[PDB]
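Example record used in the benchmark description.
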Amino acid sequence: EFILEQMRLCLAVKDYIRTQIISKKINTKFFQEENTEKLKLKYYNLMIQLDQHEGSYLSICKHYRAIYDTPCIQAESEKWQQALKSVVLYV
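Model output (structure tokens):
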């Protein structure tokens, strides 16, 4: 959480290179989300915001596919609909 916090601050300053540099320090620390889900959602949402800046179109698709996490996300279908629609829209 501490290392994820300043990423949004660096986005706010609009210095994308430093955000991308500090982003690589979390991805390798996977398989710890057995009891946390908010962290994963925010973690993926930051890259959703970042990647669609310049021209990226596959990475945003990968993230929206990654919104397939713990069933706590798909048990409220009213927004699971657009969650599964945005991916096929970006494909």
